[PDB]
Scaffold this motif. Structure first.
Motif, short mmCIF file in Angstrom:
data_model
loop_
_atom_site.label_atom_id
_atom_site.label_comp_id
_atom_site.label_asym_id
_atom_site.label_seq_id
_atom_site.Cartn_x
_atom_site.Cartn_y
_atom_site.Cartn_z
N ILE A 191 63.93 -45.67 40.94
CA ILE A 191 64.72 -46.45 41.87
C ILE A 191 64.93 -47.84 41.34
CG2 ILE A 191 64.72 -47.52 44.12
CD1 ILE A 191 63.02 -45.12 45.04
N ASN B 18 70.13 -50.24 46.45
CA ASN B 18 69.15 -49.52 45.65
C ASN B 18 69.65 -48.16 45.24
OD1 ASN B 18 67.25 -51.55 45.66
ND2 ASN B 18 66.08 -50.63 47.31
N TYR B 19 69.60 -47.92 43.94
CA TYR B 19 70.07 -46.69 43.38
C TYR B 19 68.96 -45.91 42.69
CZ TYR B 19 74.70 -48.63 44.24
OH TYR B 19 75.82 -49.15 44.84
N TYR B 20 69.23 -44.64 42.41
CA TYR B 20 68.26 -43.75 41.76
C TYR B 20 68.91 -43.20 40.50
CZ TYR B 20 64.57 -40.10 41.64
OH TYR B 20 63.50 -39.31 41.32
N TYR C 78 62.97 -40.74 49.16
CA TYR C 78 64.08 -41.52 49.71
C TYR C 78 65.36 -40.69 49.74
CZ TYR C 78 60.84 -45.30 48.34
OH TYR C 78 59.73 -46.08 48.14
N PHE D 156 69.78 -40.91 49.27
CA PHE D 156 70.81 -41.72 48.67
C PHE D 156 72.17 -41.13 49.01
CE2 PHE D 156 66.94 -42.04 46.30
CZ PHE D 156 66.81 -43.39 46.01
N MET E 9 70.81 -46.32 48.61
CA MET E 9 69.66 -45.85 49.36
C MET E 9 69.99 -46.07 50.80
SD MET E 9 65.86 -47.43 49.53
CE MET E 9 65.27 -47.03 47.90
N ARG F 122 68.41 -46.59 54.67
CA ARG F 122 67.24 -47.13 55.36
C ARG F 122 67.41 -47.12 56.87
NH1 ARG F 122 64.58 -51.03 52.66
NH2 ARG F 122 65.20 -51.65 50.55
N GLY G 195 62.77 -47.62 53.48
CA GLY G 195 63.54 -46.57 52.80
C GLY G 195 62.89 -45.20 52.82
#
Ligand SMILES: OC[C@H]1O[C@H](OC[C@H]2O[C@H](O)[C@H](O)[C@@H](O)[C@@H]2O)[C@H](O)[C@@H](O)[C@@H]1O
Ligand SMILES: OC[C@H]1O[C@H](O)[C@H](O)[C@@H](O)[C@@H]1O
Length: 1180
Positions: free
Chosen positions: A1113, A1126-1128, A1149, A1151, A1157, A1159, A1177
């Motif tokens: 992340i 926030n990215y993965y 989490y 996405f 992300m 939340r 998250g």
């Protein structure tokens, strides 16, 4: 051989019984023939599930004992295989039939099943203590180690590059807007492959489309190739973004060759202009799909708004000098409600003018002056000038404009000096907000507020609906008095601010009240919607926002008229009880009533072509108003609330007493004038067409103790086929008041004519085209022919309160006529133009008691012109509310030829205005400061997508983007001639107007700058123009927009400068890099490969990728802010989207569609699974 469904919804197929397969779908029907749906049924030895709606055989799971089991479509239990359930979850069942859980390797591949046994697809996790991504397709575990991008770094330059390169890096060789480039830009290549044979130097006119040679990305390139192929230029082809760059470039050239051949063949490039234009609109970045079209709120009109921004670095011509205050409506004039729904809806239509800018405020005053002196200025005719104004769209502009207009009239006409001055320049507001009346009154009533409270109650109690209507009781607003006590009448000082504006239960003129105008209908109330509903209902159009032609309108109008005049008495589009409504409107004390042209004449076709069925009754009411309407008022109902007791009729009785008679019990005037004796009027009205009285019941009009023993005669009486109108005392039934002054009515009445026969009349609700209820109006007999009950306005300074208008008998003596309809046809001949007709007919309105004539807006219609986005009916119906030039009111073409508006030439207007003065009537100018339409010149603005109040839409990527708007005026129109011209003269003569500070700005108006040409810097925004978020061309890698304005700061694709553009992904020891089609390295930007995968390249120019044992992340902060979050990213750099991702510590989490992300919310699944994401998250 068909299915049929019962009232219940049970389904048969003709009937088949048992197990059968109609049209290849396996179904089961019971012994009685009904189709089994949504259940397991047992047939033969195999249990089968049949689907909820279709009833088709499908795989499903059920719980046998305590263990889930799986059933396939053929009814066999599943062993050693994957099988679904109806919801959409997949499970796996082992050799023993039992569902498996957790991480499982089958057939040499690894799948992840959660606790519930659900197969997880598009799921990233460290499963074996090593990263593993589970396929979106089958859920099979991949290591996500192989790069999925298919395009290695390649050079694009070759033998054609120097030929197709730009001749010049400037405005000569590039079609542009403010230096920037667009999708449909054409440019001048160095050389031209004429006829596809020989390269020859280009001449200045040899322009070619940029899309022949360059593309923003491979997807667009592939689409261009496929599109042009389909038009005969190639064997029809399919290319994808996945196709190699080399192949696409080669194919572009064979298309270029074919293009030059059809240019030689046709000796033209216009065919290509149209091909490019068409193609460009195909692409989402270059059309409304990237504009977030929406229709809620005022966005309903045109599809959505863009607010322009102050951005000196990229778009400095468009800067507002920090003057774009949005939604400063009266209740929010100081911005103190900016964060609530009390912020004004600044955006309404077209190009919204920035009326918070002092320079623009001055210009609006210039225009106002021009209108109030139109005749002096344009015909040197001091009798052809407007006398007052209607302010259009008060709540959609800066409320300073009210003060500016107020103070102007004070300065030039001394409207604050006397009622005679004030009432010589009657001025009204279109001010819909329910709290505007109190504001307007605190500001001294410089213009009259509308009174929606009464218009509203007409809707509820009479005008709207065939049956369920609010009682007439609601017209009283008894709560006005303490405990609703109509015996004691103690006014409630502590009332909750809820009620009708002016109480009329017993109005003796003793309490101060807010001056106002009121109406039953308007050009824009109870007209535009019904007329369209009628067209929709008869299939003439599909949507309310649909464009229609005038013929389409004419056909619809015929149904509208047919419904309006329906003898049944039922009305589908039209309003009920209009006569009865007008009877009340026209007798009410403390109001200036307004009458709608379309209640007197038909709303379509030619001006005054044919009267309505209501015309006679309304005409009589109007003439009777002159003769009899004066003095105090009372109003009562045979009713106590929502619900009616046994005897109760809910019949409303409204009375006026005569000139100086203010009360029921007052017997004579204080000044001993006698005018009162033959004045006064009685009105009885009901909303129940099936009303029948009890034989006992009597209904009374308390005409007052100033009218003891007096003979009264009917003006208007309803019956079962119509409403009779009596023009004089002799032709009507009489009835005499008693000693106390009451007219008594029974179920059955025998009236006597004064001279002549007896008449019979029942107090009976009726139903026909003119009424759904009861209506009776009575007047005193013996009225003189020239009797006039109106009060002249006094020249004395009555009041030092500072206020302009005052509600009194003089103001009440006025009547406004709104004399136009938005749906009038265009004049068939010059002679039938509205303003010609008004001149010949001015007489007729003098005798109906009109003191002010509200004329349509006279400004030249923007017509069928449409630079983008949704056209609005104001524009294509030429009604004058949608205009390009604010000062063109029907002037001739420059060649000398006539050029009328819909209402006629400027001479016709001056003649119409003069004619109204010759007949003692005022002319009202429609002042429309909120917007302007169809400006022919383009500029590049910085724009954000917003709702009506100028608040950014919640889920929009369209934020601070460059956009081509149509914001610039021709500069050679009447706005250029007359713009700002009268201000200098005005500043010299009335300095204080220019020194007085306005509330919303803290500043005085600024005449130091004149507006001869409109441009974006004076605008708040525009309706979306359907051009696209990225019509202004941009490089994806650097995120810089191309520009050629100044040779010091050129930015172009490298191909066009005859340099080498390399494009693709390239690995090095440090990581992966990417080069865009224009040859630039990607830094701090997201990039999409040809297979649809997304990547993020950091500041250093390297793809972000997860390492072993570390958190995949990553927090991203980009130049493009909307993408922050926030990215993965997986080990091969691919961004996970629309799925769950595990971190190094085992936390899960989720996405979203775009990789962000999620939340602090619940989230749902296609199989109906629900999950919760905490604030940090994580997934609970
Ligand atoms: O709009 C003026 C109106 O305000 C109050 O009534 C509002 C509303 O009350 C109910 O919802 C009824 O169903 C409607 O017919 C009313 O308009 C005052 O009570 C009323 O007297 C006044 O006309
Ligand atoms: O398509 C027509 C449909 O009629 C019904 O609703 C039947 O249940 C269904 O099997 C059929 O296909």
């Amino acid at each position: 051989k068909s299915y049929v469904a019962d009232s219940s919804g049970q389904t048969y197929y003709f009937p088949l019984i048992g197990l059968q397969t109609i049209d290849g779908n396996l179904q089961y029907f019971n012994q009685q023939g009904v189709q089994i749906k949504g259940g397991f049924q047992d047939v033969n030895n195999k249990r089968i599930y049949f689907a909820p709606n279709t009833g088709n055989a499908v795989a499903n799971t059920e719980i046998i004992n305590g263990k889930l089991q799986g059933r396939d479509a053929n009814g066999n239990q599943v062993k050693n295989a994957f099988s679904k359930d109806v919801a959409g979850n997949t499970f796996y069942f082992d050799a023993n039939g039992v569902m498996l859980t957790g991480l499982q390797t089958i057939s040499g591949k690894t799948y992840y099943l959660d606790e519930q046994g659900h197969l997880r697809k598009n799921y990233a996790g460290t499963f074996n203590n090593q990263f593993m991504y589970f396929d979106a397709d089958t859920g099979a575990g991949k290591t996500a180690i192989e790069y999925q991008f298919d395009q290695g770094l390649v050079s694009q330059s070759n033998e054609n590059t120097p030929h197709n390169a730009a001749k010049s890096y400037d405005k000569s060789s590039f079609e542009n807007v403010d230096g920037y480039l667009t999708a449909d830009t054409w440019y001048r290549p160095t050389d031209i492959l004429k006829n596809g044979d020989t390269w020859t130097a280009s001449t200045e006119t040899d322009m070619r489309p940029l899309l022949m040679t360059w593309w923003p990305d491979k997807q667009t390139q592939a689409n261009y190739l496929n599109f042009m192929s389909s038009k005969g230029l190639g064997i029809t082809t399919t290319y994808t973004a996945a196709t190699s760059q080399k192949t696409l470039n080669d194919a572009a050239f064979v298309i270029q060759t074919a293009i030059e051949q059809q240019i030689s063949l046709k000796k033209s490039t216009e065919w290509l202009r149209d091909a490019i234009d068409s193609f460009v609109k195909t692409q989402a970045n270059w059309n409304k799909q990237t504009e977030d079209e929406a229709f809620d709120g005022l966005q309903w009109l045109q599809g959505g708004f863009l607010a322009y921004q102050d951005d000196s670095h990229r778009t400095p011509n468009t800067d507002s000098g920090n003057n774009r205050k949005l939604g400063r409506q009266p209740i929010n004039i100081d911005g103190s409600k900016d964060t609530t729904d009390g912020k004004g809806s600044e955006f309404l239509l077209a190009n919204d003018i920035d009326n918070s800018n002092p320079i623009v405020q001055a210009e609006q005053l210039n225009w106002l002056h021009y209108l109030m002196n139109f005749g002096s200025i344009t015909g040197n005719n001091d009798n052809a000038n407007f006398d007052g104004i209607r302010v259009d769209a008060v709540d959609n502009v800066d409320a300073d404009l009210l003060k500016i207009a107020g103070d102007y009239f004070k300065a030039l006409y001394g409207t604050d000096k006397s009622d005679a001055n004030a009432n010589k320049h009657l001025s009204i507001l279109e001010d819909w907000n329910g709290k505007d009346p109190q504001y307007v009154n605190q500001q001294g009533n410089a213009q009259l507020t509308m009174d929606y409270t009464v218009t509203s109650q007409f809707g509820n109690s009479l005008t709207h609906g065939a049956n369920n209507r609010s009682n007439m009781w609601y017209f009283l607003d008894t709560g006005y008095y303490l405990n609703g006590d109509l015996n004691k009448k103690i006014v409630d000082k502590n009332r909750p601010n809820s009620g009708t504006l002016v109480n009329r239960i017993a109005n003796s003129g003793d309490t101060k009240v807010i001056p106002n105008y009121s109406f039953v209908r308007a050009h824009d109330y109870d007209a535009q919607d019904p007329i369209r509903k009628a067209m929709i209902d008869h299939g003439i159009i599909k949507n309310m926002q649909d464009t229609f032609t005038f013929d389409q309108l004419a056909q619809g109008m015929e149904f509208y008229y047919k419904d309006q005049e329906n003898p049944s008495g039922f009305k589908k589009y039209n309003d009920y009880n209009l006569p009865s409504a007008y009877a009340m409107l026209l007798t009410n004390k403390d109001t200036v009533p307004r009458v709608y042209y379309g209640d007197m004449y038909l709303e379509g076709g030619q001006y005054m072509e044919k009267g309505t069925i209501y015309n006679p009754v309304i005409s009589a009411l109007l003439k009777a108003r002159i003769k009899y309407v004066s003095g105090g008022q009372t109003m009562a109902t045979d009713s106590s609330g929502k619900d009616l007791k046994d005897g109760e009729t809910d019949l409303l009785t409204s009375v006026r007493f005569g000139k100086g008679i203010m009360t029921s019990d007052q017997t004579t005037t204080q000044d001993n004038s006698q005018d009162y004796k033959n004045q006064g009027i009685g009105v009885i009205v009901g909303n129940n067409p099936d009303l029948k009285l009890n034989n006992d019941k009597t209904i009374t009009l308390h005409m007052g103790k100033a009218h003891k023993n007096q003979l009264y005669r009917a003006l208007v009486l309803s019956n079962d086929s119509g409403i009779d109108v009596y023009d004089s005392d002799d032709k009507a039934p009489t009835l005499r008041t008693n000693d106390n002054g009451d007219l008594i009515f029974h179920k059955t009445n025998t009236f006597v004519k004064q001279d002549g026969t007896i008449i019979n009349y029942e107090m009976k609700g009726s139903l026909n085209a003119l009424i759904s209820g009861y209506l009776g109006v009575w007047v005193p007999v013996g009225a003189s022919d020239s009797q006039d009950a109106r009060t002249v306005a006094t020249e004395s300074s009555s009041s030092n309160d500072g206020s302009v208008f005052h509600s009194n008998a003089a103001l009440d003596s006025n009547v406004i006529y709104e004399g136009f309809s938005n749906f009038q046809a265009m004049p068939t001949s010059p002679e039938q133009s509205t303003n010609v007709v008004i001149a010949t007919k001015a007489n007729l309105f003098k005798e109906l008691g009109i003191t002010s004539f509200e004329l349509a807006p006279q400004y030249r219609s923007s017509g069928d012109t449409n630079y983008g986005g949704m056209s609005f009916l104001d524009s294509f119906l030429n009604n004058g509310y949608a205009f390009t030039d604010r000062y063109d009111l029907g002037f001739n073409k420059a060649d000398g030829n006539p050029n009328p508006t819909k209402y006629g030439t400027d001479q016709d207007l001056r003649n119409a205005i003069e004619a109204l003065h010759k007949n003692g009537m005022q002319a009202i100018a429609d002042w429309v400061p909120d917007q302007i339409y169809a400006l022919p010149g383009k500029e590049v603005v910085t724009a954000t997508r917003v709702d009506e109040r100028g608040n950014q839409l919640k889920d929009t990527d369209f934020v601070n983007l460059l956009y081509v708007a149509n914001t610039k005026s021709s500069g050679v129109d009447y706005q250029a001639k007359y713009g700002g011209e009268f201000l200098d003269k005005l500043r010299e003569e009335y300095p204080s107007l220019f020194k007085q500070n306005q509330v919303s700005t803290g500043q005085p108006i600024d005449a130091s700058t004149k507006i001869k040409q409109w441009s974006a810097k004076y605008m708040n925004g525009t309706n979306i123009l359907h051009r696209g978020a990225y019509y202004v061309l941009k490089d994806w890698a650097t995120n810089q927009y191309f520009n050629i304005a100044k040779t010091n700061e050129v930015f172009l694709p490298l191909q066009l400068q005859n340099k080498d553009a390399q494009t693709g992904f390239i690995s090095d020891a440090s990581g992966v890099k990417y080069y865009s089609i224009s040859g630039y390295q990607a830094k701090d930007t997201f990039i999409e490969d040809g297979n649809g995968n997304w990547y993020y390249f950091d500041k250093d120019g390297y793809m972000v990728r997860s390492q072993q044992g570390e958190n995949p992340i990553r927090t991203v902060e980009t130049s493009v802010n909307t993408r922050n979050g926030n990215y993965y990213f997986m080990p091969n750099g691919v961004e996970l989207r629309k799925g769950f991702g595990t971190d190094n510590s085992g936390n899960v989490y989720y996405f979203d569609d775009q990789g962000k992300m999620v939340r602090d919310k619940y989230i749902n699944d296609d199989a109906n699974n629900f999950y919760h994401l905490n604030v940090d998250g994580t997934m609970s």
